[PDB]
Amino acid sequence: FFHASQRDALNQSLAEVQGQINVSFQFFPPRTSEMEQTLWNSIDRLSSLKPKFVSVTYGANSGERDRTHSIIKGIKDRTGLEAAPHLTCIDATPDELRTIARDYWNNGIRHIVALRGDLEMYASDLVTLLKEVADFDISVAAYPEVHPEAKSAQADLLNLKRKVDAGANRAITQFFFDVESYLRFRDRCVSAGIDVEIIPGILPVSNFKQAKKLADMTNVRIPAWMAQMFDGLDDDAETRKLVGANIAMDMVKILSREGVKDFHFYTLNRAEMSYAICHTLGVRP
Amino acid sequence: FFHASQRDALNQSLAEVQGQINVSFQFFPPRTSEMEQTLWNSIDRLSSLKPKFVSVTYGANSGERDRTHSIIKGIKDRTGLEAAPHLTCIDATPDELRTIARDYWNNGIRHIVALRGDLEMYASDLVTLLKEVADFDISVAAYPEVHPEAKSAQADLLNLKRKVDAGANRAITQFFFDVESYLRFRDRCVSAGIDVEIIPGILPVSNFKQAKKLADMTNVRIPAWMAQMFDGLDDDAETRKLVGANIAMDMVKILSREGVKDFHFYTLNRAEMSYAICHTLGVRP
Amino acid sequence: FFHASQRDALNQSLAEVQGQINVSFQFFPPRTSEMEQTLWNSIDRLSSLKPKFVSVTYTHSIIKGIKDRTGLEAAPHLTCIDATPDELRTIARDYWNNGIRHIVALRGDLPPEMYASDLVTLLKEVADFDISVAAYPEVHPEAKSAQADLLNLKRKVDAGANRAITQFFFDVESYLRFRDRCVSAGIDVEIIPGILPVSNFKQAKKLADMTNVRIPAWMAQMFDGLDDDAETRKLVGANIAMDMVKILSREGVKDFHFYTLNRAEMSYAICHTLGVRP
Amino acid sequence: QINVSFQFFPPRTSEMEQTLWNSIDRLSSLKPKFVSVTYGANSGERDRTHSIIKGIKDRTGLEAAPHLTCIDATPDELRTIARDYWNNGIRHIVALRGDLEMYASDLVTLLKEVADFDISVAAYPEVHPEAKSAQADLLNLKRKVDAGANRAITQFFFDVESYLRFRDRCVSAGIDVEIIPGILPVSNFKQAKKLADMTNVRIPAWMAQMFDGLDDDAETRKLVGANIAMDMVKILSREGVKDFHFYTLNRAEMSYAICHTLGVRP
Ligand SMILES: Cc1cc2nc3c(=O)[nH]c(=O)nc-3n(C[C@H](O)[C@H](O)[C@H](O)COP(=O)(O)OP(=O)(O)OC[C@H]3O[C@@H](n4cnc5c(N)ncnc54)[C@H](O)[C@@H]3O)c2cc1C
Numbered sequence A, B: 001f002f003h004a005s006q007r008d009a010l011n012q013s014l015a016e017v018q019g020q021i022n023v024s025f026q027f028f029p030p031r032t033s034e035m036e037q038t039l040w041n042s043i044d045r046l047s048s049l050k051p052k053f054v055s056v057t058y059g060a061n062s063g064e065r066d067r068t069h070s071i072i073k074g075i076k077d078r079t080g081l082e083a084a085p086h087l088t089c090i091d092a093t094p095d096e097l098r099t100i101a102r103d104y105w106n107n108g109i110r111h112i113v114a115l116r117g118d119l120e121m122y123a124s125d126l127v128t129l130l131k132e133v134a135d136f137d138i139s140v141a142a143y144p145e146v147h148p149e150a151k152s153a154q155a156d157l158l159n160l161k162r163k164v165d166a167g168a169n170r171a172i173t174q175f176f177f178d179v180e181s182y183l184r185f186r187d188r189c190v191s192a193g194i195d196v197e198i199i200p201g202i203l204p205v206s207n208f209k210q211a212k213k214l215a216d217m218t219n220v221r222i223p224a225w226m227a228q229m230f231d232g233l234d235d236d237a238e239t240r241k242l243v244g245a246n247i248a249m250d251m252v253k254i255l256s257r258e259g260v261k262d263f264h265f266y267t268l269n270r271a272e273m274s275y276a277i278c279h280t281l282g283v284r285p
Numbered sequence C: 001f002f003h004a005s006q007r008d009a010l011n012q013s014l015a016e017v018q019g020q021i022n023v024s025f026q027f028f029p030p031r032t033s034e035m036e037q038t039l040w041n042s043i044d045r046l047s048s049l050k051p052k053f054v055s056v057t058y059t060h061s062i063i064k065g066i067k068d069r070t071g072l073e074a075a076p077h078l079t080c081i082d083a084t085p086d087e088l089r090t091i092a093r094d095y096w097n098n099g100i101r102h103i104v105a106l107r108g109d110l111p112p113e114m115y116a117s118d119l120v121t122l123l124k125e126v127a128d129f130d131i132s133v134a135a136y137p138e139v140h141p142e143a144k145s146a147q148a149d150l151l152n153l154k155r156k157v158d159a160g161a162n163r164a165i166t167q168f169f170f171d172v173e174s175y176l177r178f179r180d181r182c183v184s185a186g187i188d189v190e191i192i193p194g195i196l197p198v199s200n201f202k203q204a205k206k207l208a209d210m211t212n213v214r215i216p217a218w219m220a221q222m223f224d225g226l227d228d229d230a231e232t233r234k235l236v237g238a239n240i241a242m243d244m245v246k247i248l249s250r251e252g253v254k255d256f257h258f259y260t261l262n263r264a265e266m267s268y269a270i271c272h273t274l275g276v277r278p
Numbered sequence D: 001q002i003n004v005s006f007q008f009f010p011p012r013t014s015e016m017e018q019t020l021w022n023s024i025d026r027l028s029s030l031k032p033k034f035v036s037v038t039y040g041a042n043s044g045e046r047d048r049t050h051s052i053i054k055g056i057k058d059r060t061g062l063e064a065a066p067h068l069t070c071i072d073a074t075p076d077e078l079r080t081i082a083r084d085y086w087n088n089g090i091r092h093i094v095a096l097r098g099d100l101e102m103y104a105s106d107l108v109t110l111l112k113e114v115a116d117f118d119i120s121v122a123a124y125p126e127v128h129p130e131a132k133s134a135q136a137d138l139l140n141l142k143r144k145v146d147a148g149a150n151r152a153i154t155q156f157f158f159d160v161e162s163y164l165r166f167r168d169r170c171v172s173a174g175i176d177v178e179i180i181p182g183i184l185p186v187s188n189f190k191q192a193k194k195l196a197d198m199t200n201v202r203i204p205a206w207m208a209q210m211f212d213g214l215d216d217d218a219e220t221r222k223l224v225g226a227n228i229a230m231d232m233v234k235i236l237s238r239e240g241v242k243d244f245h246f247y248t249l250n251r252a253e254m255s256y257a258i259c260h261t262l263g264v265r266p
């Protein structure tokens, strides 16, 4: 019985991973007092897992940069964790960006997630600018399914290489649900001579309607079986959570077996799903 | 990438099962007003899935038979579903059992789950007795991992055959977590010439401490990876639920692929996990 | 990589059976002073594994010595090829009156009238003995047909045997198919595999040929060229036996009977792999 | 159809010296494609490695490859050493960086400049402990192959899938040379566990459990270890592996028997 045997082997291998998996968590600036409370609850909960770092988004063109910086300082003060602000360049001048970068460095914030931003400079230009300011750890975005604006898959891949050559020392992927796409992309990164680990960004899905809208805008494929899995659950938050957890747990189990030892979670500021997924990877308090 | 491909295929096959899976749900008589409320909530919720039948346990030697009968009538009146009482013989005389059986039949209750009972007559004796009373549908217990009191695996298997030959038309298994054990047992049932479907009894685990105590008393193996999965979760009900759901969903996905189209859920009177597992099998309102 | 994953699952399942496997060990009466010492050493070494019982081929003395030395259930083998239906009742009653409640009832190899079924019936007429009888997955050489020999096993069980122990075999599929045919025939006792760990292939093959036990081509090839290499034979033979019991365990076998040939090393190691440890 | 090679180390005692030559005679009868001898900067030096290589060549006629490292050696020293080896009929070198400047790829390049050596290099299915990433380590192996290595020999492993997945990644990366599994037959688990822990080589739970309780039982360890190794090579062979490199630790019995099971016989 192949399928049963395969499952037992996959599960046992996952069990033996305990203590070898590095994780990171991504948060966004709360917009309500209710979300603020939720976030700090989640930060406390997830901090107990000793993530390698956490990060905080910055909405391009939002003009709310101060919120990002304030959350980052709060995290460092409260937890002692490495906290990395996201920084976009599409909405700031190089001079403004150098000032922002210098202030981060002087405030002990020395890992930046460097992005172009949701709509002059491209992300690689930001990477170069940041390294000129100081010796930052820099993480950049990777797209196993190709960024929607890329002229070609080759162009997008060479762009990642450009960002790495400019000084990026981590790549974090856009979320995906087609696991084969990530694995094929990881191999293509080797073919392009990219020597940094390609860290999968995991989106645990509880609100499928919303995840689908974003996937559709970002060129991320939702397999037919996954669409079928969430069909009929618009008003059943409980079942959606269980189904979503199952999907994410399956994904990390397979990725772990294929040698992935780094995961970045898009928490949407909630701890429950990411914490449980980490538990299955042997990442525990 | 074998593991990824295998998952996609398994998931898609599960998606195509929609509308082909029969399910049944097992409940027990509530002992508190709180549990009473929970049960009827669960009955309403699960009834919407159109189970082939539901059943209600009867604790052997408990002397609380009237509770079982009362719950069964309540279910039939409320839902129109086929509801099957469990009946044990270890604690009643044949005459008492015939009276009980006749009263059930005359009350429109014509499917009985016939058991010996947790500690004279063996279950096969009860099956014979029931068929003498009337043409009941009769379900009996099967043990993929061998009943703890059996002289041998062969003896236990021939006992199942005895119960089927006496008139049992369904076999429902003790819960298991070693899926290969069920599949091997299903094949052994064919070797013994048993022509009834062997319906897996599924226990969705949220309280592992308690499931383990019962498994240990019933000769049910808990794989090491499963013990590791629940390790450290004694005080984390949320994570236990997500982990447990993941395990049960994986099990039914594999069983479905191997051709199982009937599942019996040990609900412990709660709807959430069983309902979600059914959802993944395409059993939906 | 199905083969790799399958092996990992099989090995892990074996690791998890630890503490749930019943084992028994078979010994023979020593013919020399050297073998005498070897035997009691093996007994001391193997007793630490807490076997469900041990047996001695046919003897009465060894059985007694084992019982006193270790307190293990020691079952003498008894054949009806030697004595008369009356002497058997005398030798049997003599056992029960000493603490010997388990007997391996056999017809016996024939030297250069009644069958084992008759011996089981006889032994039981004396007392409520534990009776173990021989089963033959590949059919006893004298039997007229597979079904006839199978029905014979049924007779022996119906007569009072509560255990069947198999002739040794090397084709696991043969054992498994036979086990299935037994249940189909309504035989409700376990069919306990008799395992022969092979270190001397020339000798094992001689015996296999006389007993209708098949030696698979892969096994013949595995031992080819090792007539003068005792060390490699031991490693090859241990590997074969370990693989066999690993497969058998996954198929739900929880009882094993070891033909030790009075040596502890190989059986002790195989038991170790089954989680049967001091 | 199966090729084998055996790895030895320079004996540091009279007792081990006797054991090694016994093992060489035993294993040479299997006609390995080559044998190799390790180097320890503080456990024998280059002269001891070379002495054993010469002895093997003289005694058996087999191709014998020294493991040559580049730590604490200058490029001019390495060129002089390589020239000497080539002139002495040593035509296969296992080119390594070394257990603590140059990386192994630099040594491969240097050696190919000297002469058309057969060169074998180290590969790590579970990633070299110092690599900045699995991607970087794979790109390094490709650098070594592109510089002229015609063979990769893996660190030992006990998770067979790890080797299989690694081989697939090598092929995907366009690394076209054989990725030969290094096999460590285990008769002393305490010693093996130490070696594995230091190199990030996973020991499956079932394997640790298999050796539990055998600290003082050498005989059972041998039988259990032989079973593990025979099983591994059987699976690997089924998956198309036609070359095996045995970490003998100067003992012949286990490797010889494993080879027997692969059909490699005198
Ligand atoms: C992990 C992660 C975190 C993120 N965090 C944020 C956040 O905090 N705030 C936010 O607004 N967005 C965020 N994003 C989204 C991101 O900003 C968008 O996906 C944006 O469209 C691209 O950003 P980038 O850094 O990848 O840009 P780039 O790397 O510069 O690539 C963007 C597009 O430009 C193309 N391109 C690159 N160079 C050239 C060139 N020289 N000429 C022509 N085309 C070129 C690329 O191929 C690609 O199609 C995040 C995305 C990820 C994966």
Ligand SMILES: Cc1cc2nc3c(=O)[nH]c(=O)nc-3n(C[C@H](O)[C@H](O)[C@H](O)COP(=O)(O)OP(=O)(O)OC[C@H]3O[C@@H](n4cnc5c(N)ncnc54)[C@H](O)[C@@H]3O)c2cc1C
Binding pocket: B056, B057, B058, B059, B060, B086, B087, B088, B113, B114, B115, B116, B117, B118, B119, B122, B123, B124, B140, B141, B142, B147, B148, B149, B150, B151, B155, B156, B159, B172, B173, B174, B175, B201
């Ligand atoms: C789906 C399911 C629902 C259950 N519901 C209940 C419930 O509502 N109330 C309750 O108290 N328990 C219940 N049980 C538990 C059950 O009662 C116990 O497992 C009990 O120990 C065995 O019951 P049985 O009907 O299987 O008995 P049996 O089938 O009679 O078998 C019991 C044991 O007797 C052995 N045996 C059978 N015939 C003979 C013979 N002629 N001579 C010697 N040994 C023999 C069998 O091999 C076995 O070991 C349930 C179990 C399952 C799987």
Ligand SMILES: Cc1cc2nc3c(=O)[nH]c(=O)nc-3n(C[C@H](O)[C@H](O)[C@H](O)COP(=O)(O)OP(=O)(O)OC[C@H]3O[C@@H](n4cnc5c(N)ncnc54)[C@H](O)[C@@H]3O)c2cc1C
Binding pocket: C056, C057, C058, C077, C078, C079, C104, C105, C106, C107, C108, C109, C110, C115, C116, C117, C133, C134, C135, C140, C141, C142, C143, C144, C148, C149, C152, C165, C166, C167, C168, C194
């Ligand atoms: C675990 C084990 C332990 C053993 N220990 C010993 C020992 O200690 N001493 C020793 O000398 N030998 C021993 N033997 C070997 C055994 O004695 C021989 O195999 C002998 O040939 C058959 O013995 P049996 O008990 O199987 O008899 P049987 O069951 O009677 O079978 C012998 C043949 O007779 C046939 N047969 C049986 N009844 C009838 C009938 N009524 N009509 C027609 N045909 C019939 C059967 O099919 C079979 O072919 C042992 C064998 C095993 C597997």
Ligand SMILES: Cc1cc2nc3c(=O)[nH]c(=O)nc-3n(C[C@H](O)[C@H](O)[C@H](O)COP(=O)(O)OP(=O)(O)OC[C@H]3O[C@@H](n4cnc5c(N)ncnc54)[C@H](O)[C@@H]3O)c2cc1C
Binding pocket: D037, D038, D039, D040, D041, D067, D068, D069, D094, D095, D096, D097, D098, D099, D100, D103, D104, D105, D121, D122, D123, D128, D129, D130, D131, D132, D136, D137, D140, D144, D153, D154, D155, D156, D182
């Ligand atoms: C089959 C085999 C036989 C061995 N025999 C011996 C022996 O006899 N004696 C001994 O002392 N050791 C021996 N070793 C071990 C070896 O020496 C160590 O593992 C050592 O740490 C690395 O050797 P290497 O040849 O693999 O080096 P490399 O291939 O150079 O790799 C070493 C590390 O450097 C990294 N790296 C490579 N290029 C760069 C770069 N440009 N910038 C940054 N990092 C880089 C690699 O990714 C890796 O992490 C052996 C190993 C194997 C697998």
Ligand SMILES: CN1c2c(nc(N)[nH]c2=O)NC[C@@H]1CNc1ccc(C(=O)N[C@@H](CCC(=O)O)C(=O)O)cc1
Binding pocket: A057, A118, A174, A175, A201, A203, A206, A207, A210, A211, A214, A218, A266, A268, A270
């Ligand atoms: C920075 N993110 C991002 C990106 N890609 C692009 N182009 N832009 C981005 O901002 N990929 C990674 C990450 C994805 N972030 C997100 C943010 C919200 C939801 C979303 O579905 N939110 C729902 C429900 C949230 C919940 O379940 O709590 C919503 O209601 O908005 C999904 C992914």
Ligand SMILES: CN1c2c(nc(N)[nH]c2=O)NC[C@@H]1CNc1ccc(C(=O)N[C@@H](CCC(=O)O)C(=O)O)cc1
Binding pocket: B057, B118, B174, B175, B201, B203, B206, B207, B210, B211, B214, B218, B266, B268, B270
């Ligand atoms: C009739 N049942 C049963 C059996 N087998 C035997 N021998 N006896 C039985 O009564 N197998 C099938 C079914 C199993 N029923 C059960 C009943 C309670 C729990 C248990 O774990 N209850 C926990 C928590 C319940 C919850 O999560 O809500 C408890 O606290 O008692 C598990 C299986």
Ligand SMILES: CN1c2c(nc(N)[nH]c2=O)NC[C@@H]1CNc1ccc(C(=O)N[C@@H](CCC(=O)O)C(=O)O)cc1
Binding pocket: C057, C109, C167, C168, C194, C196, C199, C200, C203, C204, C207, C211, C259, C261, C263
């Ligand atoms: C009671 N036995 C038995 C039988 N089958 C028959 N027909 N007769 C029997 O006596 N099957 C089970 C068991 C088999 N016993 C044996 C006895 C010796 C050897 C054997 O080959 N021994 C070699 C060397 C022993 C050693 O390795 O130390 C020998 O010739 O002594 C194999 C199985």
Ligand SMILES: OC[C@@H](O)[C@@H](O)CO
Binding pocket: D038, D155, D156, D195, D247
């Ligand atoms: O002795 C085994 C050793 O050479 C390998 O682990 C590579 O370092």
